[PDB]
Design a protein around this ligand. Structure first.
Ligand SMILES: [Cl-]
Ligand SMILES: [Cl-]
Ligand SMILES: [Cl-]
Lengths: 289, 292
């Protein structure tokens, strides 16, 4: 238990339960993790946020201890549009129809898709260390193909990645965690947190969900994004983009997708809330207050 | 493992970079045949007998592949770059007394072949490249559609030991799925099962898999840089050239090779990627006519 003073809830939805740690009081704030992690990646910043907010730390649909909806040929329940609908249902179970939202990695993709589809749900939005899925794929030249190979590899038709990942999943997940930190090793993480990530990744069913998520990320999610950029749609919700310091700035890019956005680099690799918990917490608290 | 070249001799040829295994048959003008990934010299077994009626045919395992030695690699993947492989095979051919010869390559072996022609054109009378575009052209094309369709160029090029460790759990599944994936029908039916077993046994050796990853790492880095120098100088291969590709293989490929070669002809064949196994009579005929 990495969340002192937080409850544990499975929240019912039409697509399956969402697991969350729930703590604090005040305005509601939902925190969404990404790959290859779970809700526990927020354990270092959740307490400072809970000083001021009611904090709901949720496992994404099919991740962690959340239920795994059956997928289909277009990967629908693991599209960011579907994940956002499911988390909107979960927040309604708690009586939250207007809330603050911060996401990281895949959870940040859920979050900006939520803001594009249903802006009235959000008071404020923070996205951590991402650009829109459309922008990634538009940037996908030799240098990007090499640097972020896993967007194409994990999106290969089943069972190719599932088969490869089964041989030594501990090694793959630990290498991903290490490779995207400033330090290049696991020293930025709490070993208890790494064990949560390892345990989740050890399950073949959980890994299949992850591949479905990246398949959606290459196909429907991209198409959904393309419709908005073609329509000139921008997020109206007050928005914060944080990114790890370790091409146009991320702020230059999000200003093209959002009409009220501020942003800043954090001295950190990808995993801002774990590598740079103090700076990340401070920036979020200032933003959401 | 089957002998798929009835009556061909066998040689290990010493070079400064390690031994090259070859099957050798026929008589006449010398013709070197180079395989690619994830195969070995035996992929030429359905066309080599026909070629051997007209040529002295040398069917070699690439450096580090099949039964050729595996040089230790380095931080720039040097021995598995196509420039280094071409230098090594030039040495091997010199050991046989061939300093000017005909060359046909497929897949990685075709990349060795056009690099050989760019670096050392005087070594070649004529050259054929099967189902490839230049490495520079593949990476230039890179966008979302190609990243998704041809993922393995970026996957196998990731820093060791990532692809090595992913390939280790079930290597048979991966090599068979690749072989099947690039044929016209998408299954293994085009291959002789005895040839598949050669490919499988090679891929079952972690040292051989590491070489393959080093080949793709070179393919992403030094090989691409070597190509980039030539295209930005407008260097074109002067050696008479044939480009043969499968209609369900690459991707107009002739238009691409006309930018890289000043005397090139080409044709498609109805086939997936593996032209000499999927379309042996047509491939043999095209080669015999071109080299004759
Ligand atoms: Cl992401
Ligand atoms: Cl190739
Ligand atoms: Cl190609």
């Amino acid at each position: 238990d990495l969340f002192p003073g937080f409850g544990s809830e499975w929240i019912n939805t039409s697509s399956g339960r969402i697991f969350a740690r729930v703590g604090g009081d005040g305005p509601p704030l939902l925190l969404l993790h990404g790959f290859p992690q779970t809700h526990v990646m927020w354990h270092r910043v959740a307490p400072k946020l809970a000083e001021r907010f009611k904090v709901i730390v949720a496992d994404l649909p099919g991740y962690g201890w959340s239920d795994m909806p059956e997928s289909d040929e277009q990967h629908t329940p693991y599209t960011k549009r579907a994940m956002a609908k499911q988390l909107i249902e979960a927040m309604e179970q708690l009586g939250h129809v207007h809330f603050a939202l911060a996401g990281h990695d895949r959870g940040a993709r859920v979050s900006y898709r939520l803001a594009l589809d249903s802006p009235g749900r959000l008071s404020k939005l923070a996205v951590l260390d991402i650009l829109p899925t459309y922008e990634y794929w538009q940037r996908m030249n030799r240098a990007y193909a090499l640097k972020i190979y896993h967007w194409s590899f994990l999106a290969q038709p089943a069972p190719l990645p599932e088969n490869l990942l089964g041989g030594d999943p501990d090694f793959y997940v630990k290498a991903k965690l290490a490779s995207w930190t400033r330090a290049g090793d696991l020293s930025a993480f709490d070993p208890r947190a790494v064990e949560h990530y390892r345990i989740a990744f050890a399950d073949p069913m959980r890994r299949h969900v992850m591949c479905e998520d990246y398949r959606a990320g290459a196909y429907a999610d991209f198409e959904h994004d393309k419709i908005d950029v073609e329509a000139g749609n921008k997020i109206p919700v007050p928005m914060l983009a944080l990114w790890g310091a370790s091409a146009a700035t991320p702020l230059d890019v999000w200003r093209k997708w959002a009409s009220d956005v501020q942003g800043a680099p954090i001295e950190s690799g990808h995993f801002l809330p774990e590598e740079a918990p103090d700076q990340t917490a401070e920036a979020l608290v200032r933003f959401f207050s």
